[PDB]
Amino acid sequence: DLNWISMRSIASSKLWMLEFSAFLERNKHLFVHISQSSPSYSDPYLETVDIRQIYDKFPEKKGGLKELFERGPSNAFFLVKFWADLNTNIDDSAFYGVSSQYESPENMIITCSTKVCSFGKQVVEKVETEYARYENGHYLYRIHRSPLCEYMINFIHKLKHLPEKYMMNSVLENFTILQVVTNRDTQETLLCIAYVFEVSASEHGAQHHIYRLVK
Amino acid sequence: PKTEWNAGSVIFTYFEGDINSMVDEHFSRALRNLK
């Protein structure tokens, strides 16, 4: 029952996302990035999306998004649309990384699962686990510079080599990532974020829109 | 699913081929007679 924060940002009752970035450096370039600041009560309610609208873009049945939503608490579930910034020449040898940070009032051990889905079928999943560090008066979870699956490096190289932005978007329309952060002991879904992608129409710069999943 | 430990994390692979082929299967399906 700590809802006010979760109506206004990417957070459940027990975990709040500080940062998420995927990047490439030899120096640095952000493909996608989210950064939340401290929630104010006066911040707007996030827009809501009915979850049944995205089920066919993630795995279904046993290990699936629908099942997950039915179980872990419903205020844990979010949808992020990214407009990715693929305009970098650093790729033409370098490090590809994803970094994220979460805060909580509880001291837990968490696992973060990120799963690549192609046409709703799951392809690859990286699972990281992180212990808590106390700071100010909360617990901080910091998953720093984890390398990106070779699947994604290859995908990004080919995505970038397409001649027309409509083709990029056709490739991206059936490409999704599902992030699930779980408490390792009680295995209670702390956060679940469904990612969907387009390429940014700017020549440089990445954008995002954050929705809260419902019903 | 194939399982691999690397640099502190566990990676599950859900397909039997080579990765390059996996990426291509997605691209070729997405771009097959697109408008």
UniProtKB/Swiss-Prot annotation, chain A:
Keyword Protein biosynthesis (UniProt): no
Annotated tissue distribution: Preferentially expressed in lung and in skeletal muscle.
Keyword Transcription regulation set for record: yes
Complexes and interactors: Interacts with WWTR1/TAZ. Interacts with YAP1.
Localization: Nucleus
Upregulation: By FGF-1, FGF-2, calf serum, platelet-derived growth factor-BB, and phorbol 12-myristate 13-acetate.
Protein name: Transcriptional enhancer factor TEF-3
The species this protein was found in: Mus musculus (Mouse)
Curated annotation (Swiss-Prot), chain B:
UniProt subcellular location: Nucleus
Highest taxon, organism lineage: Eukaryota
Paired cysteines (S-S): none
Function text: May act as a specific coactivator for the mammalian TEFs.
Position of the signal peptide: none
Protein name: Transcription cofactor vestigial-like protein 1
Subunit structure: Interacts with TEFs.
UniProt similarity note: Belongs to the vestigial family.
